Amino acid sequence: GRDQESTGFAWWAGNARLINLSGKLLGAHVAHAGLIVFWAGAMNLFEVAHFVPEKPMYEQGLILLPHLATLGYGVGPGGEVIDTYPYFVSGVLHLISSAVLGFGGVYHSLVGPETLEESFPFFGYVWKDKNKMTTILGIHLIVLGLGAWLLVWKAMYFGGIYDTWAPGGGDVRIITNPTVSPGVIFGYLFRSPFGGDGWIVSVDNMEDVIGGHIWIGTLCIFGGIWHILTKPWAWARRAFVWSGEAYLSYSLGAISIMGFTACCMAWFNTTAYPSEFYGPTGPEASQSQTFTFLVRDQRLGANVASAQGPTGLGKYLMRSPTGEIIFGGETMRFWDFRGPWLEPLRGPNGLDLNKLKNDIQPWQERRAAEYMTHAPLGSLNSVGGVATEINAVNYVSPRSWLATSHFCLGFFFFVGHLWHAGRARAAAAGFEKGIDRDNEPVLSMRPL
Amino acid sequence: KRGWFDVVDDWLRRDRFVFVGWSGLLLFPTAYLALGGWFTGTTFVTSWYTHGLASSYLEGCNFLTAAVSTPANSMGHSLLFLWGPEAQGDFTRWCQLGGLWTFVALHGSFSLIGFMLRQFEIARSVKIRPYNAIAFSAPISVFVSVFLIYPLGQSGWFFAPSFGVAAIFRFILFFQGFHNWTLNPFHMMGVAGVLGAALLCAIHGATVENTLFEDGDGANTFRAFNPTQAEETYSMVTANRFWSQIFGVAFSNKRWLHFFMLFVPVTGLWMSAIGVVGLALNLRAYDFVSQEIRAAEDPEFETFYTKNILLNEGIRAWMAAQDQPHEKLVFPEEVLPRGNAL
Amino acid sequence: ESTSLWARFCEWVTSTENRLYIGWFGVLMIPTLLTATSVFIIAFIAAPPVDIDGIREPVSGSLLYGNNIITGAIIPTSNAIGLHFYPIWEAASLDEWLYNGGPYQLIVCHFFLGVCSYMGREWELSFRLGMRPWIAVAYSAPVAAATAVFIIYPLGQGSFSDGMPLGISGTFNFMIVFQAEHNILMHPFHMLGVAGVFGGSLFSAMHGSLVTSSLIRETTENESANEGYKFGQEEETYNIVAAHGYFGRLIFQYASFNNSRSLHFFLAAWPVVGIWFTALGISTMAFNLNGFNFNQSVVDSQGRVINTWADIINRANLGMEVMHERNAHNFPLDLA
């Protein structure tokens, strides 16, 4: 390797010695890729080995198997897990692939060439080469487009995708008419992130999800071809720092947004994150509670329609601030919630009183009852319930784990933008190692 | 020939790895016992007989829940000596009686005196000003006011904070429920001191590290320094201009900057210590009578202050039965205040 | 040389000769922070009572409605609104907008943009002044905490009514309810946060006292020692070796920073890392991943539960939980 004597970077900043070593830097990125693939395989086998059919997926602390379930593997109607072999082969395939990925990372790091420029001009690059950088950007942009097309190919030609909104009950459904209209796609992208809109988190059917991934696959391929055949224009060359650490900060900022978006996706979305596998969302459980008591109180004999709560608002049913009939109580805040179990009981004006009074099916009552007892509330030591609970139930929702973890990662990677971007500008300008005592810029400035 | 004081002074103030000094004759014995008292109590001593609780690792507590709990309230303000009239030399019964708490509080308080004397003794030998000792006065005021003065004004040591992580949390929650300690303007000044000191610590550290002079060619800027150098290691002029245009006001005197970093935290803790002295006598800033009289006259007047008062009612009623077993409160369910449903 | 309007405008914006540095982040910071400041001052003094719980029970928070400085607050947006965007133009009248807690959303939204721009403005001046960056990185720690209590926690909880009220007494209500529903005291991140502020307060006093104790004699006793330092001095105003000699003997030699550059990084890293984690604590507890729950953890041989200090903490939590928002719950579980 190297040392601080010949580099100026200490061991705690040791990977910063790889900035201009293309070959060794390649090995590092291939090795960390092997680590990511290793974890996916290792956890997939771990979750399969620790999986019991007596309990739903969200009760067993599984976060990878729900992803495979949503792709329509080993699941039947209603979200029941019928087979676990597809989860096993997926875990093995990643685990074995990490071995070859690790070897290339280990080879390209220790034995392979230190720099790729002289021996392999195709792969060799210098960060200041705006053209070469866009070609690498363009190539890896195409492989992302192909990855997006794999999702639509599976949902349309290879088995299909799990549709929790499917007619006749949630099941694996082959998408045939994905929503590809520009108005729908642009509608999600440019709607507000606030309640009722929810930006892209509010995608509510698999036709839009697959139609959306068709746009992404097509944009990335065109964007990949565009960024291969062109080089940055004059306005781009004067608006960006063209260094290795600057490119890193650009991704750290972008990856930071994705981490926050994933955190909100796992917390709110019930289409790409079906509640049959990830458990109920926060809003779903709150709505489920009022639904459960409305059903019980109706059976005990009560006009839930005209039942008045202590505050004067409807105890079971009220109106949202726009007029829709919604469940009452503190769940009023979650009136935007839309789930495959409550939607059948929702007309154009909101909840249907006649449907809520005569046409509530037992599977709907069972779904709502289960969800309210598996609300995302839980503790760090995995004690389910509010903080004032007792140690009886060992449960924390997978949505709680996913939302909390990928928010923490999202925030730290935002600090990565701040750190690696401030340094990129300072290093390029030339004052990242301190103020020059000979010509301090402030001394030249006139007194304030 | 040299006298005894001079011979001992020579050995006590030898420049060794761990300085002893004269103050060490008080610090190290007491400090070791206070450290030993806490470890022994949190590992083997129980609070079953003084509090009806388990507070030792042996009983099954974590580092979070283990504590050295205070004596029972019937003991009053007894010093709870090993030879005292409560437990007469019976060590195992002394531990069950909570005498280990007074052991840690007493030997621990004298270790604080011994440590402040250690700061004065070392400062004089090194021939520097004694501002670190004046600073350590603030932690001492907090310890004296909270662990000593506060229970001395209450029924007994039972209401002092027990030496434990979760035990301190109970003490903190007790003060909100019974004293409205958040509303007290002296905790408010103490909060501003601690949050202000934390702000000053981060800003000064960041400002210095970001106005460093380039005294080397390595990216590792830590190595481009020498403690004996005459030149300043960072630009005060650049730092002053940065904060003058960002924040509007900046330090121009480096000496004033560091005294301020010492004044904010010390003044904050001292103000809190004044408030706890008031709480020892239940002289608490619990309520605003004007708003309480108003709220009693119209059932429409609502403020966040009145919402906190209702929260304190819940804390007192639901906590008293177990927190104060000596009171023998048998509150039936119907008499406890609770809102609708939840 | 600059003749074009934009060229002349961009030179003025990025000029370091302004009394207060405007920047490109400043053209975002100034309008947002002035908007939030003006609405805060008007609403704090004279704003009508706000229905925060959505139960048609208005809460007064303004000085002209019988509040003092301590109890006065900007009441969060109505629970009926939830996370819905509620600008002024979405209300039929300003009276409706004031009733439902509109100012809180306006202040919080423009304030969030202001502090993010203020963070960017801190980097920008450093670049213009040729300093190193990462003062903004240190400032990201308080920014993260502000977004956690104003933005993220309402996001996870599903309503801006659960954001921190903009007041002194309102803050305390936010903390007490937070303990009841999340047991923040037992969360390891508030623990790291407390170590951040207790440690930062300790290190601020230690650094300040050690430097003040090693001031080189440059004045007389009839004047302040501060007179010994002249703005722009090349030499050091205190002896670092003398302060290291004292601290290295108060505990032991290798527990002291003889490196002044290492010392100030530690002075910066410790509170910033601490406040980063406590900001993540509130953010995580926004998604109901609460603190440690050790209730009924210790049980005896026959199955009886032996209470601990955690169980006493639980009884306090039960008191706050049943009393917070008395008229807002119709069902036993506080899922929302």
Partner: peptide, 30 residues
């Protein structure tokens, strides 16, 4: 009365901030 005294104290404190920033003693090198 209280509401008038609270407002004067608050705007009085804000007025001091304005003067401390713009009508400050300028820091002069040597």
């Amino acid at each position: 009365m209280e509401a008038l005294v609270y407002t004067f104290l608050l705007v009085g404190t804000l007025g001091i901030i304005f003067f401390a920033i713009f009508f400050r003693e300028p820091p002069r090198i040597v």
